[PDB]
Amino acid sequence: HQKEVQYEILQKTIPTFEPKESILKKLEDIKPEQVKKQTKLFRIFEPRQLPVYRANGEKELRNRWYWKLKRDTLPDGDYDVREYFLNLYDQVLTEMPDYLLLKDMAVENKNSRDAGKVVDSETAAICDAIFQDEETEGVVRRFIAEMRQRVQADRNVVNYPSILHPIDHAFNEYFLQHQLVEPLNNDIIFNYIPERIRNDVNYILNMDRNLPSTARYIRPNLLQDRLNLHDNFESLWDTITTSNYILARSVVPDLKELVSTEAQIQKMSQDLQLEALTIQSETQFLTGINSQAANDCFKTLIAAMLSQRTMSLDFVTTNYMSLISGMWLLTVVPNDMFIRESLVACQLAIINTIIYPAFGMQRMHYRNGDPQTPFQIAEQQIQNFQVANWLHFVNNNQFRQVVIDGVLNQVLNDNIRNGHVVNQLMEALMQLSRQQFPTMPVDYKRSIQRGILLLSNRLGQLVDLTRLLAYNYETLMACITMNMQHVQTLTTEKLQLTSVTSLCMLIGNATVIPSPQTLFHYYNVNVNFHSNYNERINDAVAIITAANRLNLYQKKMKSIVEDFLKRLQIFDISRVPDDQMYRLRDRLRLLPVEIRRLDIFNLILMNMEQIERASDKIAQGVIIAYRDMQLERDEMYGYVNIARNLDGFQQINLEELMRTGDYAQITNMLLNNQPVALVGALPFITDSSVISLVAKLDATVFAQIVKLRKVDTLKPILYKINSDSNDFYLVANYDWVPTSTTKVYKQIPQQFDFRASMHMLTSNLTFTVYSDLLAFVSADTVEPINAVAFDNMRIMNEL
């Protein structure tokens, strides 16, 4: 009960999904980066006809074309506007196309006299409207009737005429110029195969598909870990290694033609003579020895080494058969793959139950925390060359680090790979079978020596098993794309030494190597996980950097980091410790932004002010000048209390005033009639009444600021006095200058100019994008009887 409670306390800090095996599904559901295709040109603006007015305020008989936001939904308040632009950045990023083929969007130009086409249907609508307009220049009309697309099918190129606002053109041109599709040929697919599988003679790889020159693909982003999650993220790294371990378990092959469990069990029972002993646990000795345990051990060992997940050793000390098998385990598996306590416990059991008693040595009084393991002390304290040499190997058989194709890999000693070191183990334990065991009771001594010989007499089977395990490890490690970082994990995989005994005593001579399809699936899952990891890092870094550069100080990067971890698909975010979340935020803040996202952000940032000033529902400020200023004469309004700039006035930032809550300066200025300019995205009331201007209602809208100490309800009056006003006669039939004490800081819409909006959009005529490159590889394997290892000899030679 207590142990369960403490382990639950520890596990609640690890974001691993509790049904471990379910993780496999979540890992295999990660698909390649979804390929996005553009269906229409990206547009923020449209041309719109608006009424215009003469200098006297009379509506003219013609409308004029102006650029207007297609979706005018900008909020009030500068902070909310910057949030709106961050959301626009996210929308553009999500809807950003990976490639474009303009011919899909090409439509018929109705007024073309030469079978002309334009992109897109919106351009066709604009061109038709301009063609029918009476105020259009004859040259522009003739050009619309004559402008042509150019389709060069031999070159795989298309150019189409388009009408676009300069910002819209900037976005679409960026999409066209920076597509993610690369030419795909058989050389690229061949090099996509891991280099060590292309060199393995056990796999026959062929290219029985023809790729047209129009083939395309998107390169996965196999950048190595920029967050260094193996460093100082114990819970996240525990989760990562657990997921990798589950996947590796899924891909490790199953053993075939194992020794008959009945025959081996009867042999071991006859040799050990346990019934004749006085062991309190007579039944438990040979329990756990079966084919299922052997397969589980094989899978656990290879998967743990592949995922670099720490293993714990679970054994009953009185079961010396488990210890004898653990001798082989420590011989072949690097000792750094085990939690220090488990390795020390297993080695000390071996020393104090088998090895030192064999040589008549005083039982080792080992001290926990000793920099030396029990075997490292025994190597010096044991003089026999066989046992000492085996101990030396076991002490120094840690993983070696080597970078292959940019991936860090944990590789084994060559004596493990060829299985030769098993001989040394055999030699060592053969010596242990000849030892006197001076003071040991003779029946127990005989049982131990006969178990030692049980393991010894399987020398050929154990050499074959070691070579098979090493070959499977190397072949599946060729399929790893992220650095195999070795860290001692929080939790371990528990390895029963009885399963090790099953594997050692039941392995036959049937070679089992990973199938080519299994290798390709494992490699594809690894590539998908790596690419998704890098892409989500890019998205998180882009959004964090944009929020900082947009000065969104109330934005919580915690939500961004949680979304990132959720999109990694293998973290239960509820169990991520807060210190690790904040460390993740800090490390993400330090990374530079990916080029494509950063360029899109630069575009949005540089066009922010223009997009904002195009909105018809927010103004950029309001000047309160307690002198009478003439209403400006604007073609869009008639008479309008519009300020072109804020020169000559003290500026109070409304966002800063809202954030501080200090209204002393604004209150003092409003009470004393001190001219000022309130700056910030503000909603305004459009007042067309001349009587309202005479009543001076625009000056009556600022007392609520002092009353409520709020600026979120400030709605200044923008006068729009023209012939459409019900009381415009007051302006027309009387001698006076319409004035007001307040002006609204707002901009005038940009006029539509055909020359400045007509562009040629260029793309490719057509291509096909492919995702599964390894589907183009015909992969076969040799008969397992003939499968060879790195040394060109058969993996299993006992035949």
Next chain:
Amino acid sequence: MDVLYSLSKTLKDARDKIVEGTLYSNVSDLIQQFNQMIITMNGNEFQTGGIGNLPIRNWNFDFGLLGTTLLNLDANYVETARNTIDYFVDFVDNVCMDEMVRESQRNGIAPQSDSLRKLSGIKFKRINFDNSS
């Protein structure tokens, strides 16, 4: 020698480019290189000058990274950068002086001062960047 030159070059770039009001895009790569230098040098002890009247100087590096979040650099950013830059510039000058006053008949091309010998280790090779002089 390449690591010492890279330290000096990074510091010169920091002095010339980390200025108030400058776009972060003007320094982003430089800020990455500077942070790499800080990470590489942090936690290392150096000693320069025990020859002639050159004083014994002890150097400890415990510095925070520079921010990557501003759009334009401001006074706070420049002050933090300037403090770090001043310490690093003093260290580089002392290391250069310590190396300049030493000579060897056998391997005179190889580093003579212990500081430059330490900087020739692999753990500092990350600092190395553009060698244009």
